[PDB]
RNA sequence: UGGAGAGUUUGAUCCUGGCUCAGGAUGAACGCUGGCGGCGUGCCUAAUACAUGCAAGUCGAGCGACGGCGGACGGGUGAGUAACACGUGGAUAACUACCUAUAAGACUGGGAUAACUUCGGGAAACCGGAGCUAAUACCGGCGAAAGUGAAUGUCACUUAUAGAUGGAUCCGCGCUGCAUUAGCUAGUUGGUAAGGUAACGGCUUACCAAGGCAACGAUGCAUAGCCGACCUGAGAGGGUGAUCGGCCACACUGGAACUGAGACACGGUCCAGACUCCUACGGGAGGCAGCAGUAGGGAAUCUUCCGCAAUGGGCGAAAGCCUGACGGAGCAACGCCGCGUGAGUGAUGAAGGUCUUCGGAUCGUAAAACUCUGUUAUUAGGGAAGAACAUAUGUGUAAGUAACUGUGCACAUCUUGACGGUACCUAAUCAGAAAGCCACGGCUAACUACGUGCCAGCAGCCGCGGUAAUACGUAGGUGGCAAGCGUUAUCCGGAAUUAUUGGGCGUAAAGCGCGCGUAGGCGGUUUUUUAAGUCUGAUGUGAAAGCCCACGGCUCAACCGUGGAGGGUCAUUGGAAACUGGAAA
């Protein structure tokens, strides 16, 4: 507004918040690295084999994996692709991005470098799922 | 006082110099006082000697120790 | 480990100045007692020796040379 | 970086009948693939500057990183960034080879440069994206007369520009002046080029 | 010089308004594939204990048989500190192993002792004792003083000068978030006193004295090294602090010193604490945020490489000597750049795939052949300008007495390249080894036939899926980029969505329930000064290096080189008085 008021208080701009909460900050030090920052990726360790549904009008079935992350906290997940060589308490790489119409799930289990290593059943969409073909 | 110095610059496999002067307390790479001009080491598609003795005599008055391979510039 | 021999000077150089300093000051601490009596016998011809040890702020350079005038600036 | 594959898909699917991947045509009722008078023709409002970006990119055989690195070389000229860009594409060593009639395409003009058979001023220049500065000439090495493919270009005269001295069999040239438009191209405005880059 | 948009609330509109996508980035990770010439950058998460190697010496023209200069420069790191830490301009109360310019004087007279053989104790760190000795070591008269050696010359000592160099210090301005934090320090504010360091000093103490700071942000919390620059942007701005330079602090932790020219000392030192480990359990040793390598939390960052030739630094008069500064190599698509996996010639829609009346099309001169080529490389070699010197020796500068000396002012010519049988380049059987990856409703660049068929799924939003479904896996087809393609998390633009350049309040979010009113903000007209703002002139300065404006050259180019523009809300140095401002009517 008035140039008198703008001297007396500047434009304190709009804060934003992260779309994906449970990563990427200095958390809660407890004389060791009790919890840390994972900007793109991490390890995991699993806790539960997941089976769930979307909720809005949709009626399909989905297979998450409710884990405890490497910084004491609890998140859901998802395995893209077909195969599932995963059981309880097995290491899984992470990468962010929510899943719409599921009520509370958080990230994608990377199908390349983990115990989630390689998914067969795919032949054209490949590097999104970690499937090889050394002929070409 | 001060010592006459060649700041080495230049990429991989290709040095190049700039004639400076500062005390030995100052290092080679930087905190250099003055520059009396460039110096041209390689002679292929490049000159071989370069100096400007106008502001070089300003430093031989209050004291200067040229290194014995730099003194071959100013003997020519 | 060639500072081992530098240590052997350091326990050896403490003896020469702290003998000179403690003799510099008690010649001067008795001097302002002798300058509180002023009979020209216990103050004369040793006050210039109290200034010779304040000239041995230049000879015994443990007391710094430019610091020669930190005590002797009042009596003489 | 080089474009290979002499199939007519560069001419027929773009549309223009230039001297690129095959000077003739044989499946003239159709476009490549099942895209044809049968099936979907996908047009756009940004495809009118796409096809003035895609119209040149296969012509010299250049990648995407080359044009943007040459779009702002015309920024060093006193004309605007879209005004002298076709001139700098007309001044490269590759399209001056085909302008001298010493090769038979612009792509054959890049083959006989890197293999040392065409030089500049005696010194071995083997760069197809070499900029021909004014006041320079075109050279060869001593083995350039035995080859049949230069003698192929001695058989047929191909293309005559206006900014050179024209020697189709002597294998030495002269860059007399900086070019202009409609000497090397014939069909492209300098106004639909620049709008793609915004 | 340069500045785009699309989608979604309704049965259908206009508006306000959010959320979401296309693009540029990463000292990124991770997903698939792999030809490199060449250039750069590779602890950002447990400040998690650090094996084994090398990083500080030099002087045999000191002097004996330790006396000097250097370890305060240099090379690592960000836990600390919201501050003269830093940036930027002003100021003098004073500080040099050095470097040098002239000149002085470089006298006189003494005596104690390491190494060394005996002496005894300890496993050790080693110590107590005794005979032996010089020293350029040590001592006396606003007052100290040195001598040394190849041909007296030379070279350090010593005092007063002043110049460069180097540090110190108070001062104007720039310096993050919060007011759901309003009071705050007491030797605090000041005189005075003597002591105190290079100097000023509440700099530390003593009697008196009643102040400091503050709503113009004083005090207290959590987060942080900071600038030149990097990122994005039309610009104004927003976000960042890495290699690369300047300044700063710190050394497993917490204090305190000693020598010297100007350390509270990274590799020294005495002490105290938590840890490792040995001894005869009486004691002693250890500090890789030096150069690398291992261990450790990790989704994540490399060789335990020869070596001083060039440039720079200590020591010496010189040969040279130690140099993990550095000159370079060993390894990862880590980033940009350049470059190939070929082209010229080559209609009968050859084999053959899923679509089809398979009455038929497509990829497709593609393939099959034919023809040249060998950047690149499956064959070895002659072989860098990068090295100018130093040393003297070839005979020149004055002291030439004396080109021996400091120089090397004829050359510096009997000399100096690990890398490097490198950069380069010729000659060979051979077009033969050398290409992916994501997408293809709408956006948004790119379509078809079945299997499953609100299922395995997919999804940036509209969502496509209840019996195939152009919007899921598959082959065909195409499009994009290309030795690289997508996905993630983060940051800026899109977002005129914090709007000074550039918004809003009747009903959409937003006008206090309304008066008197302190500080504050803004103030009609006239003339005259003042120059505080504003205007322009002048000087000095805001160092290299980057972006840009240009060029020999690396075969172009990335990078180097030279020039050029780029900082002042500043200090100071003159002119003008139009408005805003103090001053007279
Ligand atoms: Mg070191
Ligand atoms: Mg190094």
TrEMBL record, chain A:
SUPFAM superfamilies for the chain: Nucleic acid-binding proteins
Q: Which organism is it from?
A: Staphylococcus schweitzeri
Q: Which GO terms describe its molecular function?
A: rRNA binding; structural constituent of ribosome; tRNA binding
Q: Which family does it belong to?
A: Belongs to the universal ribosomal protein uS12 family.
Quaternary assembly: Part of the 30S ribosomal subunit. Contacts proteins S8 and S17. May interact with IF1 in the 30S initiation complex.
- Name of this protein: Small ribosomal subunit protein uS12
Its annotated function is as follows: With S4 and S5 plays an important role in translational accuracy.
Question: Matching HAMAP family, A to Z?
Answer: Ribosomal_uS12_B
One Gene Ontology BP term is: translation
Question: Which Pfam families is this protein grouped with?
Answer: Ribosom_S12_S23 (PF00164)
Q: Which domain of life is it from?
A: Bacteria
Q: Which Gene3D superfamilies match?
A: Nucleic acid-binding proteins
Q: Where is this region: Disordered?
A: 1-54, 117-136
Name the UniProt key words of this record, in alphabetical order: Ribonucleoprotein, Ribosomal protein, RNA-binding, rRNA-binding, tRNA-binding
CDD domains membership: Ribosomal_S12
GO cellular component terms, alphabetically, are: small ribosomal subunit
UniProtKB/TrEMBL annotation, chain D:
Q: What's an example GO cellular component term for this entry? A: small ribosomal subunit
Q: Is Ribosomal protein set as a keyword in this record?
A: yes
**Keywords tagged on the record:** Ribonucleoprotein, Ribosomal protein, RNA-binding, rRNA-binding
What positions does the domain RNA-binding S4 occupy?
91-155
Gene Ontology process terms (BP): ribosomal small subunit biogenesis; translation
Entry-linked InterPro entries: Ribosomal_uS4, Ribosomal_uS4_bac-type, Ribosomal_uS4_CS, Ribosomal_uS4_N, S4_RNA-bd, S4_RNA-bd_sf
- Small ribosomal subunit protein uS4 N-terminal domain spans which residues? 2-90
Which Pfam families does this one have?
Answer: Ribosomal_S4 (PF00163), S4 (PF01479)
Query: What highest taxon heads this organism's lineage?
Result: Bacteria
**MF terms (GO), sorted A to Z:** rRNA binding; structural constituent of ribosome
Please give the subunit comment from the record. Part of the 30S ribosomal subunit. Contacts protein S5. The interaction surface between S4 and S5 is involved in control of translational fidelity.
Spell out the PANTHER family in the cross-references: 30S 40S RIBOSOMAL PROTEIN, SMALL RIBOSOMAL SUBUNIT PROTEIN US4M
Q: What family does this belong to? A: Belongs to the universal ribosomal protein uS4 family.
The protein's matches in NCBIfam families, at most eight in alphabetical order, are given as: PRK05327.1 (NF003717), rpsD_bact (TIGR01017)
Q: Which HAMAP family match?
A: Ribosomal_uS4_B (MF_01306_B)
Record's function text: With S5 and S12 plays an important role in translational accuracy.
Put simply, this protein is called: Small ribosomal subunit protein uS4
Question: Which organism was this protein described from?
Answer: Staphylococcus aureus
């Amino acid at each position: 507004p008035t140039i008198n008021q703008l001297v007396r208080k500047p434009r304190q701009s709009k804060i934003k918040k992260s779309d994906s909460p449970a990563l990427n900050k200095g958390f809660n030090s407890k004389k060791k690295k009790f919890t840390d920052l994972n900007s793109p990726q991490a390890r995991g360790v699993c806790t539960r084999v997941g089976t769930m549904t979307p909720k809005k009008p949709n009626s399909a079935l989905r297979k998450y994996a409710r884990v405890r992350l490497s910084n004491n906290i609890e998140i859901n997940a998802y395995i893209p692709g077909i195969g599932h060589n995963l059981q309880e308490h097995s290491v899984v790489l992470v990468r962010g991005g929510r899943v719409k119409d599921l009520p509370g799930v958080r990230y994608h289990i990377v199908r390349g470098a983990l115990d989630t290593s390689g998914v067969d059943g795919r032949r054209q969409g490949r590097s999104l799922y970690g499937t090889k073909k050394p002929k070409n | 006082a001060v010592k006459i110095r060649l700041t080495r610059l230049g990429s991989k496999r290709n040095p190049f110099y700039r004639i400076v002067v500062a005390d030995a307390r100052s290092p080679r790479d930087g905190r250099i006082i003055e520059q009396i001009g460039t110096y041209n080491p390689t002679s292929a598609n490049a000159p071989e000697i370069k100096v400007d003795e106008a502001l070089a005599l300003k430093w031989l008055n209050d004291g200067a120790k040229p290194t014995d391979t730099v003194h071959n510039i100013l003997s020519k | 480990k060639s500072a081992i021999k530098r240590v052997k000077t350091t326990e050896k150089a403490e003896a020469r100045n702290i003998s000179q300093k403690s003799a510099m000051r008690t010649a001067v601490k008795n001097a302002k007692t002798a300058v509180s009596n002023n009979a020209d016998n216990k103050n004369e011809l040793v006050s210039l020796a109290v200034k010779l040890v304040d000239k041995a702020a230049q000879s015994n350079l443990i007391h710094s040379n430019k610091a020669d005038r930190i005590k002797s600036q009042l009596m003489t | 970086a080089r474009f290979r594959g002499s199939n007519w898909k560069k001419s027929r699917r773009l549309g223009i009948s230039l001297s690129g991947t095959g000077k003739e045509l044989e499946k003239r009722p159709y476009a490549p693939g099942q895209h044809g008078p049968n099936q979907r023709k996908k047009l756009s409002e940004y495809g009118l500057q796409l096809r003035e970006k895609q119209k040149l990119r296969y012509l010299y055989g250049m990648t995407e990183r080359q044009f943007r690195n040459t779009f702002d070389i015309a920024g060093k000229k006193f004309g605007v960034h879209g005004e002298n860009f076709m001139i700098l594409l007309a001044s490269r060593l590759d399209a001056v080879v085909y302008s001298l009639g010493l090769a038979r395409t612009r792509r054959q003009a890049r083959q006989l440069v890197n293999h040392g058979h065409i030089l500049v001023d005696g010194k071995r220049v083997d760069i197809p994206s070499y900029s021909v500065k004014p006041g320079q000439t075109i050279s060869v090495r001593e083995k350039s007369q035995k080859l049949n493919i230069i003698v192929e270009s001695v058989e047929i005269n191909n293309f005559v520009p206006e900014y050179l001295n024209f020697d189709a069999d002597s294998l030495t040239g002269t860059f007399v002046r900086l070019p202009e438009r409609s000497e090397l191209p014939a069909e492209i405005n300098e106004q639909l080029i620049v709008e793609y880059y915004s």
